[PDB]
Amino acid sequence: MLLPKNAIQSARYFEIQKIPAKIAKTANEKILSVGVAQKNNIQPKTVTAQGQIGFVQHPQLDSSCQYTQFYTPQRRDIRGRVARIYIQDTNHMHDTPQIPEGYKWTLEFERQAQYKTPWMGWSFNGDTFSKRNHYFCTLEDAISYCKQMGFGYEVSFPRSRYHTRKSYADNMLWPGHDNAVD
Amino acid sequence: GSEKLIEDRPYLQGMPYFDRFDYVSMMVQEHAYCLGIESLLGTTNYSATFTQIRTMYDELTRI
Amino acid sequence: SSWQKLIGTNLRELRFVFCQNSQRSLGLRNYIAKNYWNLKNQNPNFPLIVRECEEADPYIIARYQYGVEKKAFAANNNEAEIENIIKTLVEQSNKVNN
Amino acid sequence: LNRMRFITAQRDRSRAPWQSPKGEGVFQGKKLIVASNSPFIDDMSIRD
Amino acid sequence: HNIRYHHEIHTSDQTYHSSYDPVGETTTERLVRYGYLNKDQVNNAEAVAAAAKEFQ
Amino acid sequence: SPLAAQLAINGNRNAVRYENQNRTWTFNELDAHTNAFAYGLTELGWKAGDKLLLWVEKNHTSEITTAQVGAAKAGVTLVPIYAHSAEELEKALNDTKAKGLLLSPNSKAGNSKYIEVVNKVIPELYNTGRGSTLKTKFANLQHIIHTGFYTFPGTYKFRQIMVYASKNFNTLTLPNVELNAPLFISGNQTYTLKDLISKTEENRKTSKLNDNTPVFVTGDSRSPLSFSLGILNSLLHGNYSVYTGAQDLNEVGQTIRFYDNALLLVDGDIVKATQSLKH
Amino acid sequence: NKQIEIFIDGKPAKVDDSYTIFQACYENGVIVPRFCYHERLSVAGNCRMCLVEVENVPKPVAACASQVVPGMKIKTKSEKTRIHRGNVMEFLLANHPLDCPICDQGGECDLQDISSVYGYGISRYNEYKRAVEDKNYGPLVATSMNRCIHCTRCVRFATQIAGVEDLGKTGRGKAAEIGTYVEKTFNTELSGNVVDVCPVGALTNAPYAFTSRPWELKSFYTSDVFDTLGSAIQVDTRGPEIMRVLPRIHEEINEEWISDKTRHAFDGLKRQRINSPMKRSKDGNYEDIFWEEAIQTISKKCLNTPSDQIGAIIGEFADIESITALKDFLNRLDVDNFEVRQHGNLKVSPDFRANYLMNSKITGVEDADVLLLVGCNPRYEAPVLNARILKSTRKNLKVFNIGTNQDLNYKNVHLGNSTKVLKEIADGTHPFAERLKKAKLPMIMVGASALEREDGAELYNTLKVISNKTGVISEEKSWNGFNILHKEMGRINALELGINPTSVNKNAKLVFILGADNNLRPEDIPADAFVVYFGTHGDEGAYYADIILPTAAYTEKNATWVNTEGRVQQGRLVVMPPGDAREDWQIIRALSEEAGVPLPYDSLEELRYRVAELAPHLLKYDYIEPTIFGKVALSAQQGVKTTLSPTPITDYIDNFYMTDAISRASVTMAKCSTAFNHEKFSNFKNLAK
Amino acid sequence: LFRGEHALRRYPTGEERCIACKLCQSACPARAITIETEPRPDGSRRTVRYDIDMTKCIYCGFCQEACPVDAIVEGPNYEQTAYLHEDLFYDKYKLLENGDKWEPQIARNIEYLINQPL
Amino acid sequence: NLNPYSYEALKENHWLVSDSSKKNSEWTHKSNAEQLIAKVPIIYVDSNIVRCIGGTEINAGHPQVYIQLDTRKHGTPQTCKYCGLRYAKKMD
Amino acid sequence: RLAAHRKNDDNSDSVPFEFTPENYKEIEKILAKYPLKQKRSAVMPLLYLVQEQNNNWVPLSAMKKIAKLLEMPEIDVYEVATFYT
Numbered sequence A: 001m002l003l004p005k006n007a008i009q010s011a012r013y014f015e016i017q018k019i020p021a022k023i024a025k026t027a028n029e030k031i032l033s034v035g036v037a038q039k040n041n042i043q044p045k046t047v048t049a050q051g052q053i054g055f056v057q058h059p060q061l062d063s064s065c066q067y068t069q070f071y072t073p074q075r076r077d078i079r080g081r082v083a084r085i086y087i088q089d090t091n092h093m094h095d096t097p098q099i100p101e102g103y104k105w106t107l108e109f110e111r112q113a114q115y116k117t118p119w120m121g122w123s124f125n126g127d128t129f130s131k132r133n134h135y136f137c138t139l140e141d142a143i144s145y146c147k148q149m150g151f152g153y154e155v156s157f158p159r160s161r162y163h164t165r166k167s168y169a170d171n172m173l174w175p176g177h178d179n180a181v182d
Numbered sequence B: 001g002s003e004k005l006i007e008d009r010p011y012l013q014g015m016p017y018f019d020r021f022d023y024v025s026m027m028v029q030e031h032a033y034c035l036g037i038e039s040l041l042g043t044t045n046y047s048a049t050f051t052q053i054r055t056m057y058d059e060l061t062r063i
Numbered sequence C: 001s002s003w004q005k006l007i008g009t010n011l012r013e014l015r016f017v018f019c020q021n022s023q024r025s026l027g028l029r030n031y032i033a034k035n036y037w038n039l040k041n042q043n044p045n046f047p048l049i050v051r052e053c054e055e056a057d058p059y060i061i062a063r064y065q066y067g068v069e070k071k072a073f074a075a076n077n078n079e080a081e082i083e084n085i086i087k088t089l090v091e092q093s094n095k096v097n098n
Numbered sequence D: 001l002n003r004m005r006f007i008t009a010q011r012d013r014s015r016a017p018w019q020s021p022k023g024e025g026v027f028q029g030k031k032l033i034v035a036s037n038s039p040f041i042d043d044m045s046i047r048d
Numbered sequence E: 001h002n003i004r005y006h007h008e009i010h011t012s013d014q015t016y017h018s019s020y021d022p023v024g025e026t027t028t029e030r031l032v033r034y035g036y037l038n039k040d041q042v043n044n045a046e047a048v049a050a051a052a053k054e055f056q
Numbered sequence F: 001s002p003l004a005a006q007l008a009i010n011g012n013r014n015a016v017r018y019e020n021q022n023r024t025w026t027f028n029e030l031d032a033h034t035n036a037f038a039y040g041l042t043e044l045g046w047k048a049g050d051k052l053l054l055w056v057e058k059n060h061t062s063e064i065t066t067a068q069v070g071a072a073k074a075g076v077t078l079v080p081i082y083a084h085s086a087e088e089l090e091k092a093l094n095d096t097k098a099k100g101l102l103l104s105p106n107s108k109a110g111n112s113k114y115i116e117v118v119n120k121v122i123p124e125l126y127n128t129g130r131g132s133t134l135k136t137k138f139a140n141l142q143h144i145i146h147t148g149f150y151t152f153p154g155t156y157k158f159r160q161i162m163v164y165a166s167k168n169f170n171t172l173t174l175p176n177v178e179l180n181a182p183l184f185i186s187g188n189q190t191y192t193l194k195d196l197i198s199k200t201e202e203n204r205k206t207s208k209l210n211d212n213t214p215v216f217v218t219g220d221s222r223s224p225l226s227f228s229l230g231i232l233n234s235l236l237h238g239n240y241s242v243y244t245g246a247q248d249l250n251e252v253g254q255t256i257r258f259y260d261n262a263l264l265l266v267d268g269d270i271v272k273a274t275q276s277l278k279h
Numbered sequence G: 001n002k003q004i005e006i007f008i009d010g011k012p013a014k015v016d017d018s019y020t021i022f023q024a025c026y027e028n029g030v031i032v033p034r035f036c037y038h039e040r041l042s043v044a045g046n047c048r049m050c051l052v053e054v055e056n057v058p059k060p061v062a063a064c065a066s067q068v069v070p071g072m073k074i075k076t077k078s079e080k081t082r083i084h085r086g087n088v089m090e091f092l093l094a095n096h097p098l099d100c101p102i103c104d105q106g107g108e109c110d111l112q113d114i115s116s117v118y119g120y121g122i123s124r125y126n127e128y129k130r131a132v133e134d135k136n137y138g139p140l141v142a143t144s145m146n147r148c149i150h151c152t153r154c155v156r157f158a159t160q161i162a163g164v165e166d167l168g169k170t171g172r173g174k175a176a177e178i179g180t181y182v183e184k185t186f187n188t189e190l191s192g193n194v195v196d197v198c199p200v201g202a203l204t205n206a207p208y209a210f211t212s213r214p215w216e217l218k219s220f221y222t223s224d225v226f227d228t229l230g231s232a233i234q235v236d237t238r239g240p241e242i243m244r245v246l247p248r249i250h251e252e253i254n255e256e257w258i259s260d261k262t263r264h265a266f267d268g269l270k271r272q273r274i275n276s277p278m279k280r281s282k283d284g285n286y287e288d289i290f291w292e293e294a295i296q297t298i299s300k301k302c303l304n305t306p307s308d309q310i311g312a313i314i315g316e317f318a319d320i321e322s323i324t325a326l327k328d329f330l331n332r333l334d335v336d337n338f339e340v341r342q343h344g345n346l347k348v349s350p351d352f353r354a355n356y357l358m359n360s361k362i363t364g365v366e367d368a369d370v371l372l373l374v375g376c377n378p379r380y381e382a383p384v385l386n387a388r389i390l391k392s393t394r395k396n397l398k399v400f401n402i403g404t405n406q407d408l409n410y411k412n413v414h415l416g417n418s419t420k421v422l423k424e425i426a427d428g429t430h431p432f433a434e435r436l437k438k439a440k441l442p443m444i445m446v447g448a449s450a451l452e453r454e455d456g457a458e459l460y461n462t463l464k465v466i467s468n469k470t471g472v473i474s475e476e477k478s479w480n481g482f483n484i485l486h487k488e489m490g491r492i493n494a495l496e497l498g499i500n501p502t503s504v505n506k507n508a509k510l511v512f513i514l515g516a517d518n519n520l521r522p523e524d525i526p527a528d529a530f531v532v533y534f535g536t537h538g539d540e541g542a543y544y545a546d547i548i549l550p551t552a553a554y555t556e557k558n559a560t561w562v563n564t565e566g567r568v569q570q571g572r573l574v575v576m577p578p579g580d581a582r583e584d585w586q587i588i589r590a591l592s593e594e595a596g597v598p599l600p601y602d603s604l605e606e607l608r609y610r611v612a613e614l615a616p617h618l619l620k621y622d623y624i625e626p627t628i629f630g631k632v633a634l635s636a637q638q639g640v641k642t643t644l645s646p647t648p649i650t651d652y653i654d655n656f657y658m659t660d661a662i663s664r665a666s667v668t669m670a671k672c673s674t675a676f677n678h679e680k681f682s683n684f685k686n687l688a689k
Numbered sequence H: 001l002f003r004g005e006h007a008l009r010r011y012p013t014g015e016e017r018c019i020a021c022k023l024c025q026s027a028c029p030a031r032a033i034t035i036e037t038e039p040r041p042d043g044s045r046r047t048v049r050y051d052i053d054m055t056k057c058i059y060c061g062f063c064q065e066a067c068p069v070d071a072i073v074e075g076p077n078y079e080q081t082a083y084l085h086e087d088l089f090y091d092k093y094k095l096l097e098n099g100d101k102w103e104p105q106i107a108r109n110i111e112y113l114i115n116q117p118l
Numbered sequence I: 001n002l003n004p005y006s007y008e009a010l011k012e013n014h015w016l017v018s019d020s021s022k023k024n025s026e027w028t029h030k031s032n033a034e035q036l037i038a039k040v041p042i043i044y045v046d047s048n049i050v051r052c053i054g055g056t057e058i059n060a061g062h063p064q065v066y067i068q069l070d071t072r073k074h075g076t077p078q079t080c081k082y083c084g085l086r087y088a089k090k091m092d
Numbered sequence J: 001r002l003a004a005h006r007k008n009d010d011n012s013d014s015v016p017f018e019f020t021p022e023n024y025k026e027i028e029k030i031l032a033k034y035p036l037k038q039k040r041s042a043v044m045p046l047l048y049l050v051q052e053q054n055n056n057w058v059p060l061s062a063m064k065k066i067a068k069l070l071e072m073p074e075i076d077v078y079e080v081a082t083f084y085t
């Protein structure tokens, strides 16, 4: 269910699709107040699957982030991250996979640390989080998940292949008269 | 976290997890998991049924 | 005239950030269209940057020595008001730098 | 006792370091002149 | 040498679904819920009959 | 044009074979490439009588032949040189008053290479601006063309020089090919196009050379006799010329046994001689 | 005739009458197996895997090649279709070698994915299989021709996309081989895409060969920096190691193709890397130091050195954030010049995106009618753009050139190799002037290297007057054909922020080489100038620097890049920088704070707030902001010099595979230079085309 | 059929059987097998790293079941008791020497198992 | 004998840095199997196509692979891609 | 038999092949049969002429010359030559 029915509000709540305006609360953001205002002005007012301009939205740490479980005494780093939300189509190597891809939005966190421990040359990730990406049936669902868990989101929208006129008669098109073209 | 580990692995790679559920009865759990997979696939194990291997070894497991 | 000719030495950079299809940026956009080449010819070596976005607010940023920025709002300003704002920006250098 | 060779082999597969010059070198102005250590040879530079 | 019917053509994958409206729903209430009858346009025999015909 | 005979006859038969490059040019292809070279020189202000020093070394047979035939068409004087050191290159450049110098950058001028020798002789090439006319010590030195692969400041590539003019949008006009116009300066003597044609005819009649017989010119091709008996002979009477610059006699014998009756212009330190047909 | 109705598995569907059966099924979510039909190649019926059953027709019908007939009923799930697919799969797998373990296509193979779903399941071909000797195509294509299924995808791609003619079916029967009849290499600047278009392991990525498997890789969508087009790519990695690069579908940029440098120069990031700050002694010995010591030394030098003696160099791989940080830091020190090299500067003002960008976008060549290259070599500068231009020239595009006679795969007129033709066209006394006049859409593509010449400003003015007087920039048809194909993403990003490349510091005692490694001369830096180098690989900038500060590669930082048509693309962090390397903006922020002029960026969010203060359009990703001042910016002005030297206009790229530090520090690019440079070198054009 | 100690076999000519196809790595339920592959200079496809964590191994036989060339097997040796967790970290050296030591009995058992359907 | 990394050596050895000693492989690949298989000589087969299973029976070696001995150059040795054995035509 | 070029020295690129003057007059009639926009059609008659004048076998150099004459790809000429017995 990649595309919610835009003809009816039951697609998803309007509050979820809203992109809240940034409020300058840090000293640097107060210094860069005009930049914050201009980013609020230029950024898309809503996030929908039909959009065309990618955008990065900051992690809104407020009551919306109330429903997170990763703000652990031993883990104070997860609940500030910016995920990447995009539809990951099948790689160009193959076109008819056993399990087709591109029917879901991948939500991916960047790798915090990766290093080969030397005794056996074994790959170790310093952050057990972000090891495996999340998958959401709808961009609205992914955005709602980001809002609930207090994650910022860099949303990039899919680029699908254009429709083309295909016919076997194009393999035998008549070039034309020699005299006329000359 | 055996259930989560199974969910993070293919069907066959999570099959040995059922051996350690009831290590006293290590084949009945295998039978239950295989029956679940077959029901998902909508088939039956004709070879196992006709060779009587599953019933015999499940009764040995019960013993 | 004189203030236009003094842009090269009074300032270090002049940036005009506005929108293509908004009434807020109409005066600034018209002034830039009319008066860009006058200032550019009078100040061939002065940075006169023009940037436009879909919904950006009209700002004229005057950058003075030691990177001192003087962005000024220019929304719903007539070409006369745009010229007055620019003239003020090319007249604050003595006060701003000192 | 030969662990460092194995660790260097591990590291060199993804992040092999740049062997900086160690000692006196030829200076052409501000640039240190040291011959390239590429085993491959650009045959177009040595042809006819 | 017979490989055409190695894979099972018939499988036990049949699923059957039964949907029922609430038992306590009356005919007019169901007609109003489905939209064939208006909310306040009730207690009129002709309108009820028209809604029933359209629903049928 | 004197060189358009076989071009007008058929234009499809093979004219010259460059064995060391495995490149075969028909008469149409050769005419197109030589016209490209001539138009490229013409567009760069190369008037009649301008000097071009051929410092290319044996191997680049195709470039040498194209330069020779284009200079014949364009009308500029072509002077082969044998400079093996910076002093020799300086003396040749000063004496010849050359407008252009065509060289092979990677050839060995002893310990140093040709491009390094040119840079040492002309220090102004290192600091020459991109796309700007060079300010050299020499009075009339204006072009340094190299058949190399990399780009050196102050010098231009052979392909960059040539201009493959079209039949409609071309504006450059090529002057008529002149027999009396000097073409070669070898051994302190000047060879004209008519003189080269006369030498070609004399060597054809005195060495038992037919209209249809391959001629294998080995080693260097800058010699006036090599030019006369090679590409010039192909343009005149359609003889199939095969250039084997910097190839051993065994490989030459193989590529000759591929043919029936080959006139072997043997390479040597002295002006190239010739031998009997076939073996 | 406009919207017919068909039936797919008994389900009515409204489709267009120009659709094929395969297109109609795919538009409705019905997946039909295929091996030869490529969505961007000509339709062929080599395989028969797309055979489907249609009611009231006796033969199975190839869904990919057959148009939709109104009122037809297509039965994809029927047992007859199952039998057809099983028969075709059995015939495909009859002579296929049992090489799945030793074949790089395993785990991502269409043959396997279709035999597991649509095949019968078991084989009965108990006979000798055909064997074909493998061929040699070069260090990029690994050939196992016994695995081929004779689907002609490679031949069609070479003929129609790449434009080269070196593949085909030789012979007939079961002994037909799909490849070069003679022993030659496959060098077309797009040699890596035949691996993508080969459905089987017949053509595999030789540098990637045997390295990994698809199920053990994690893929990230990012943007290339090896070319100014910023082709969208998918980087597949296994832990800390980047394993491979693949194309991504982006019709606005590169369709679905990438060049070899994009695909095979990523391994240059795995060697010759800088992983620690270093200081150079008087004798030239390099010692590793801490970040604190290097920052303190650079801060001391910044504080004691006068502002007028402070310079900088902006490299190729300099992003929006890094350039913003450096510009603000140098502004806080009253430094207004960001270039120290007096030779090789771009003569384009940073005032207008119309001035310094490709105003017709990449799709312009498809839109335009006449294309005029001026010292531009799209075959090397942008092979995917070259393929797009070839596709356009097939239909109704005419290409002229006023530079070096290149070896483009299509036909192009050669107006000349010098600026004399440009001067004649500007005066209007040239035959091509009327050609531009009568053209519906003229377009001019001038290389950044061509505009970097000594008479760069004069050439720019000549091109502007040509565009204005002819119709290249026309408001009547709302067309802006003036396009400048840049050569450095760093230059594009620097122009996008308002940094004038002509601002050159003649005598600079403090030089910041921001990753610059090309066009660097020993005389461009004074012998008594303190140099800091924000580099990633040590090739030139390491040798030119007193202090070396390791930086993060384009795959090692969250960066904003500007595709030369003006696209704001967001390159993402795939793997963290090696060792203790830091991304450049963080280093600049730390240096600024230590120098007493702190910058107001605690994070990338605040840095992008600063960027929005500079240019808001840089915050709208994968988008081109329209420029309403195209004609105002590119208007001809009286009295501006247009004098042009008669020297030839040249193309800067000599070796395609080695153009940057990463490319020069790549083993695959070294093999490509060893293998293809001499085969692709010719002082004379390819007349036979 | 006894599943003892993981070991790497070789052809009777002495060439190692493993072709670095990573099927055992994919099929390992506990992900104890780590394989890194680089083509040999002669052109073959062989592992440069083949590590099995005997502390992460459940001794299930999926590696030998999934091996298409019968390279990785589980020999009968069960007296693999080690005094060091590092000693329990098997690598290609140890696996190859163990296969060289235990090839005869492994060959006999594998021959018998092959002859069952044959 | 020829220097590696050269055009001829790379073109001969599948664009790979050939090592004659093979002890470099003994280190990198942790096995002397390259030397052990270099000890094995070339097998000459009359037919144009040979079949290799790795041993004497099915399941005792590797899956069946068919090697084409009818090459562009007569009598060109062809290596098995599962095992290390080399095959060639009897005469040419 | 084999679909690829044998590595024979007698059939290498260095082997010479030029059409005889009678054949050059013969191809003019052959080219006139087919439209000027379709010179690709004459590949088979040109191969037949080559076989007539080259000891009943078509060499690789002859294939190169035929491809150059008809402005058609050498790979296409090879495909035409190999497809027919």
Ligand code: SF4
Binding pocket: G096, G097, G098, G099, G100, G101, G103, G104, G105, G106, G107, G109, G110, G111, G112, G147, G199, G200, G201, G202
């Ligand atoms: S292409 Fe490779 S993975 Fe696919 S079926 Fe053939 S051998 Fe197996």
Ligand code: SF4
Binding pocket: G147, G148, G149, G150, G151, G152, G153, G154, G155, G178, G197, G198, G199, G200, G202, G203
């Ligand atoms: S080599 Fe690959 S792409 Fe080419 S015909 Fe064969 S299967 Fe198709």
Ligand code: SF4
Binding pocket: H006, H024, H027, H028, H029, H030, H031, H032, H033, H052, H056, H057, H058, H059, H060, H061, H062, H063, H064, H074
């Ligand atoms: S026996 Fe099972 S757990 Fe152990 S290495 Fe083999 S596949 Fe992995």
Ligand code: SF4
Binding pocket: G101, H017, H018, H019, H020, H021, H022, H023, H024, H025, H035, H063, H066, H067, H068, H069, H070, H071, H072
């Ligand atoms: S399954 Fe066998 S051949 Fe494949 S990688 Fe594992 S041990 Fe090697």
Ligand code: FES
Binding pocket: G033, G034, G035, G036, G037, G044, G045, G046, G047, G048, G049, G050, G051, G062, G063, G064, G065
């Ligand atoms: S996909 Fe239609 S015939 Fe191949």
Ligand SMILES: [Zn+2]
Binding pocket: I052, I053, I054, I062, I065, I080, I081, I082, I083, I084, I085
């Ligand atoms: Zn074998």
